[PDB]
């Protein structure tokens, strides 16, 4: 008997840890090389000093985990190494229950390869994997602490829930019906955190000096100071100066990573050798591409339109309940005022009879997926749904991905 | 007087905002009755007053209300909680 091991195989960072553990660890799954050729692996990227022109290589080419070599390398680093990760040690893998996650739309052959490697190269006793939205309904089984906001004012799983998974690759609209997502209503919004970073790259390269090669610098800039307009784009542009912030450029002799200052608040003087970049319009005009892709000259439709289409493709009787039970998760949702704007803009388009309740977890929203996944792993539903090693051996490789995990069963 | 048109527009715009909000339509409440002599007849007006349909409205309201009472008896403890059942949500929508 052993508690299951839960891993969130994200394309940007990997959340993992024993089910008994309270909060998971982090693993930035990317093999990076510097200008001079020295290579860095996973969390060691945080130890780079010449942040200028480091190149990131990832196994998820476009949300699909293609290159398996480095994926296995980062899995080995994250699981086997006990020194860095607080003494946790996956000794042999055999006789260990593993619950994983994957992109909701993975090619059948790619999923076949994934199941094959995870079953036979590592020899886990049992496995269950699915997109994070599949684990979302199991928030009923535990006493979660997630703040909720309604858009109309200023048996261990919920049957009806709608999940907006805005992560690194794409923003997903996954409506789940009693556990199985209605895969016909699954809609992909191509806008995501990676595109957001690229847009910040272009805007900062034009407005200020060329930052077209400072990928980690702009990533930290997006991390620290960004927001969706609390009311509307026009309102934020009217008060652009009042909410302006300035970002301190990196100083290699003192701080490898930069930091942001609030000019209005009283704070320490900067040394005269420090270069400063002011942000007055890129703070809010970049996140607005979720609602108005036309601002950044993108022909793709916005998030509200994707949600509307996903609701339209749903059965008529259930769509109002789906509207009422929309829950947000993913890395992008932690930026301020995104949930409120989503709720208000969605309510403005729905019939007055319906009311939309938007619930977003507090704290870092990236860790919510792992939390709900782990809390599901410790329930009888996980015990029933899991597939055993000998059962996998009994069937052909395609059987698992075509029947028990992949979309091919529910399509 | 052509040069004074802008002033007139500004003043009228200033006054309309306060004028429109807190006024009672005296025409709607039959407080104004000097135009009625032009297009209305005495016996026609008294016949329309006698032929009012208040009873039909009251009886239909009572019929709908007793149907709602029966529906509430069937449903039981009504609540506005977040909906997790098609039956419960549909019945609440019917009630509203």
């Amino acid at each position: 008997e052993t508690p299951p091991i839960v891993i969130d195989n994200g394309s940007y960072e990997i959340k993992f840890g024993p089910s008994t553990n309270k909060k998971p660890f982090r693993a930035l799954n990317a093999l990076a090389k510097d200008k001079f050729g020295t290579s860095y692996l996973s969390n060691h990227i945080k130890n780079i000093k010449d942040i200028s022109s480091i190149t990131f290589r990832r196994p998820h080419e476009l949300g699909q985990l293609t290159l398996w070599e480095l994926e296995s390398c980062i899995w080995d680093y994250c699981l086997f190494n006990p020194s860095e990760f607080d003494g946790f040690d996956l000794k042999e893998g055999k006789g260990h229950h593993l619950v994983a996650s994957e992109s909701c739309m993975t090619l059948p052959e790619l999923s076949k390869h994934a199941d094959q490697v995870i079953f036979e190269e590592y020899e886990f006793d049992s496995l269950f994997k699915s997109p994070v939205a599949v684990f979302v309904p199991f928030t009923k089984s535990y006493k979660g602490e997630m703040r909720t906001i309604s858009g109309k004012d200023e048996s261990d799983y919920h049957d009806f829930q709608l999940v907006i998974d805005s992560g690194f690759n794409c923003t997903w609209i996954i409506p789940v019906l009693k556990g199985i997502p209605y895969y016909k209503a699954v809609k992909k919004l191509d806008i995501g955190g990676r595109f957001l970073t690229g847009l910040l790259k272009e805007t900062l390269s034009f407005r200020h000096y060329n930052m077209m090669d400072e990928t980690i610098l702009v990533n930290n800039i997006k991390e620290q100071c960004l927001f969706v307009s609390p009311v509307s784009y026009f309102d934020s542009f009217k008060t652009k100066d009042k909410h302006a912030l300035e970002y301190v450029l990196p100083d290699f002799q003192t701080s490898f990573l930069g930091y942001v200052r609030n000019p209005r608040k009283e704070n320490v003087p900067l040394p005269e050798d420090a270069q400063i970049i002011t942000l007055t319009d890129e703070l809010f005009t970049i996140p607005e591409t979720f609602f108005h892709p036309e601002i950044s000259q993108i022909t793709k439709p916005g998030i509200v339109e994707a949600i509307l289409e996903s609701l339209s493709m749903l059965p008529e009787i259930v769509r109002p309940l789906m509207v009422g039970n929309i829950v947000c998760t993913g890395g992008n949702f932690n930026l301020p005022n995104f949930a409120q704007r989503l709720a208000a803009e969605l309510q403005r388009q729905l019939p007055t009879d319906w009311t939309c309740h938007v619930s977003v977890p507090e704290g870092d929203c990236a860790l919510f997926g792992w939390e709900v996944m782990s809390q599901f792993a410790k329930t009888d539903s996980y015990r029933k749904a899991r597939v055993t090693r000998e059962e996998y051996y009994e069937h052909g490789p395609d059987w698992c991905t075509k029947h028990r995990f992949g979309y091919q069963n529910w399509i | 007087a052509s040069d004074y048109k802008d002033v007139e527009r500004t003043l009228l715009k200033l006054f309309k905002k306060n004028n429109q909000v807190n006024r009672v339509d005296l025409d709607f409440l039959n407080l104004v009755f000097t135009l009625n002599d032009k297009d209305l007849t005495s016996y026609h007006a008294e016949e329309i007053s006698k032929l009012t349909c208040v009873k039909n409205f009251v009886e239909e309201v009572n019929k709908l209300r007793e149907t709602n009472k029966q529906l509430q008896e069937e449903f039981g403890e009504a609540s506005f909680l977040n909906f997790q059942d098609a039956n419960q949500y549909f019945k609440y929508s019917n009630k509203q």
Partner: peptide
Amino acid sequence: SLDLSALANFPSFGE
């Protein structure tokens, strides 16, 4: 009402 009958037949995390 018949849509509810159709909805109840949907899979419920089984097969």
